[PDB]
Ligand binder design. Structure first.
Ligand code: HEM
Ligand code: HEM
Ligand SMILES: Cc1cc(N)nc(C[C@@H]2CNC[C@@H]2OCCNCCc2cccc(F)c2)c1
Ligand SMILES: Cc1cc(N)nc(C[C@@H]2CNC[C@@H]2OCCNCCc2cccc(F)c2)c1
Ligand SMILES: C[C@H](O)[C@H](O)[C@H]1CNc2nc(N)[nH]c(=O)c2N1
Ligand SMILES: C[C@H](O)[C@H](O)[C@H]1CNc2nc(N)[nH]c(=O)c2N1
Lengths: 411, 407
């Protein structure tokens, strides 16, 4: 069967055949669309099929589908599974899986880059100190003094689900949140809870607006340990504006490395519950969301004040006006410091080209419109006018319950 | 079976139950989500009729009463005997309003209950249709103080006697293909302008030429009419700061009046049913003025502002886009034509979801269309999970009449 997506700006119509390789469910039914819902331990029995599907895909990709090497490897895996009930991926298969998980990440506008991922194999890691060292090396490699390189570090897979490796932080580098008795928050409101768990674990909180959280790391299902990232490894950019000289006095800065640490990498039915990855930012993540969400640093008011916009009527578009200048500032600051960043116009155009190529070479590109369209200026970016089909391929990056909610404390 | 919607900004969680009463099919499956796709008999009619009359008598707190039972029989006897049935005025008023209430793509639904309904089921000709439409335009416009309204022409019979308004809105601007290679006026209406000129319209061949109506009565051949110009309230576009803006020659019409949709009440189909409310500012400024395929004025405006167009990252598109929308809002306000901005529109809709969840058990909403095409995440709708599903009565898209009609 065939499915067609149209672009309403260009009239270019594409045909998706790839969605036929999608078994996982979406949340949607014929009666209900759940496209805007954010969140819509395995037997031998169910494992070998997932391994088989994965290794036929790997083997196809390297042009060895049906070979001896292929067959011997299905045999090898079959056996390991029957014997130990799990299996180990070869290096080449890990690399290929992590890549394809990114490539299948339908909420990711940054996929043109999918083939260039640096993979760090951390499957020999046994302790939370081991993890810290791996994570520092990752932060350092990826940061590359501002010339950011995408990377993922991959720690041991789930076994019995009682010995999980996890990174309690939701990103490797994130700023502390601090709820005050007056009810106001100091720093980043999104990190209040995790900030509490850190303090409670023994972290001495500086209690500033931009305190870099400590890494909180679980190995082998043990209680997580605290570590501090070397400050020299944390690239930050102070935010200033090109025309507006008062902007710097607002006191804003941001870290340069976006590094998602709370997702689960599924490859060949195996579950990699610590797999922190990173690329570089698109400017709007910081300037629209991080700075201007009501439940984040919420600086829109303070910025429109300085600009002396008319704030007595929403219809002065004062918020929209401040929004743009802040985003100008983020982009200006990173560029002046030579820290890789991409604006939303350029990122969305690149994504359109990626997507079309993917249709040609692969027979499709799953894409989640709700997330692909940037949180500002949506319709003046080409992704707005692009129909997209959203569906789950493996390998894949999934959300997973936060570990403070599940962890069984040893003490 | 009981679904939860979360707001990620306020942590408010609502529980939807209205969706189990959903009847039409969405486009999505267990395997594939089509949320972002624009267009995803006697025995047939009686359950549809019943389903509808059941909800109606439930709305007037008379469910199961004799008045209810009597109607259900009357309609049954009419279907069996005539192949169709006729709605009571009260059922018609209720259906129209409820179709609006159910429009999952409409951010404006807090207003749903004040729909003025014009019963045009007694219309027989295209001239009749023209009178009714001019009357709708004038009532709804109201010297600038716009009032939501819909006019309903006779329902489909054997499907070869359809009433249609060929325009996609009652008031739109002509599209002309130029020897230059470019387009004059509104590129979205080239096809339709050709058709009008084919039927014999003297086109002024300007930029903001108000289209002629093409009215199909009783499945006949459509005829041309000009809306009296004094009925079409238009707004010249200026900016509170920028002196030069006005010299772009921009204007827009006050009354958005969707006229190509099909209204389904209780299995009966009303294929000509233009309705109008009023504009949310982003509709004109962001979409009509700025879309590559529309009036596409970003380039021109950026130059008058003298911003660095050398590179995307200066956000010059974004800068000009804002001020274009300031101008639209300011201009409508200065002329006292109702318009609403996207902040206020979305805020109002969040209030309207809460009331609907509290009062009806839910609210079908299509996030893709609800979120303004500019500044999404600073509007509250961005952070609101919504569930999209199809309830009836409904407004539905339908094929352009020219693809279908035979002369
Ligand atoms: C070139 C650098 C990249 C850019 C500019 C980029 C851009 C983005 C953006 C803007 C989002 C959504 C933003 C948000 O709301 O959080 C996103 C989501 C995502 N990205 Fe990328 N990304 C990049 C690299 C990567 C890498 C290296 C991976 C992993 C290999 C990745 C995997 C994902 C996943 C799994 C999501 C969904 C996130 C979630 O569900 O919370 N991205 N990306
Ligand atoms: C009075 C203030 C109103 C506001 C502010 C408003 C706002 C909107 C907006 C922004 C859209 C998005 C569609 C687009 O951007 O093209 C929309 C769509 C829609 N509205 Fe409303 N509207 C209003 C009145 C009405 C009325 C009176 C009706 C029906 C009687 C209605 C029914 C619909 C329907 C059916 C759609 C979807 C049309 C389509 O699929 O193209 N609205 N509305
Ligand atoms: C509840 C929930 C579910 C889910 N899947 N995800 C979340 C993370 C939220 C989404 N929106 C804000 C925050 O996301 C913050 C992390 N976003 C970074 C994506 C990115 C960009 C560039 C390079 C990269 F390597 C990665 C929360
Ligand atoms: C192909 C196709 C399908 C569809 N459902 N719709 C279209 C009209 C396009 C879509 N999106 C913009 C334009 O529609 C024109 C603007 N729509 C007006 C909605 C509205 C607003 C305020 C008051 C009202 F009474 C009505 C085309
Ligand atoms: C409810 C809604 O799906 C939610 O707010 C989404 C909308 N789109 C988004 N898009 C991105 N990139 N990141 C987000 O966190 C969200 N939030
Ligand atoms: C592809 C996508 O469905 C299409 O661009 C939609 C997105 N959201 C929209 N939302 C509204 N209100 N109006 C539109 O015309 C569109 N276009």
């Amino acid at each position: 069967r065939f499915l067609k997506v149209k672009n309403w700006e260009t009239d270019v119509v594409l045909t998706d055949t790839l969605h036929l390789k999608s078994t996982l469910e979406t949340g949607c039914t014929e009666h209900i669309c759940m496209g805007s819902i954010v969140l819509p331990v395995r037997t031998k029995d169910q494992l070998f099929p997932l391994a088989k599907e994965f290794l036929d895909q790997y083997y196809s990709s390297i042009k060895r589908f049906g070979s001896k090497a292929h067959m011997d490897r299905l045999e090898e895996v079959n056996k390991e599974i029957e014997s130990t009930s799990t299996y180990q991926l070869k290096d080449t298969e890990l690399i290929y899986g992590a890549k394809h998980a990114w490539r299948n990440a339908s909420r990711c506008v940054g996929r043109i880059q999918w083939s260039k991922l640096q993979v760090f194999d951390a499957r020999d890691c046994t302790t939370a100190h081991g993890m810290f060292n791996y994570i520092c090396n990752h932060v350092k490699y990826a940061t590359n003094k501002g010339n950011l390189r995408s990377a993922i570090t991959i720690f041991p897979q789930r076994t019995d689900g009682k010995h999980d490796f996890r990174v309690w932080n939701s990103q490797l580098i994130r700023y502390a949140g601090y709820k005050q008795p007056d009810g106001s928050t100091l720093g980043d409101p999104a990190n209040v809870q995790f900030t509490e768990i850190c303090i409670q674990q023994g972290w001495k909180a500086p209690r500033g607006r931009f305190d870099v959280l400590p890494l909180l790391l679980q190995a082998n299902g043990n209680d997580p340990e605290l570590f501090q990232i070397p400050p020299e490894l944390v690239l930050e950019v102070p935010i200033r504006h090109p025309k507006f000289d008062w902007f710097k006095d607002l006191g804003l800065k941001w870290y340069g490395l976006p590094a998602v640490s709370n997702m689960l990498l599924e490859i060949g039915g195996l579950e990699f519950s610590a797999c922190p990855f990173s690329g570089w930012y698109m400017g709007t993540e910081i300037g629209v969301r991080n700075y201007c969400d009501n439940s984040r640093y919420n600086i829109l008011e303070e910025v429109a004040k300085k600009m002396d916009l008319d704030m007595r009527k929403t219809s002065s578009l004062w918020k929209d006006q401040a929004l743009v200048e802040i985003n100008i500032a983020v982009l200006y600051s990173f560029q002046s410091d030579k820290v890789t960043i991409v604006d939303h116009h350029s990122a969305t155009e690149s994504f359109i080209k990626h997507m079309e190529n993917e249709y040609r070479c692969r027979g499709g590109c799953p894409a989640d419109w709700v997330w692909i369209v940037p949180p500002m200026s949506g319709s003046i970016t080409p992704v707005f006018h692009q129909e997209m089909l959203n569906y789950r391929l493996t390998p894949s990056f999934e959300a997973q319950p936060d570990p403070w909610n599940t962890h069984v404390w040893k003490g």
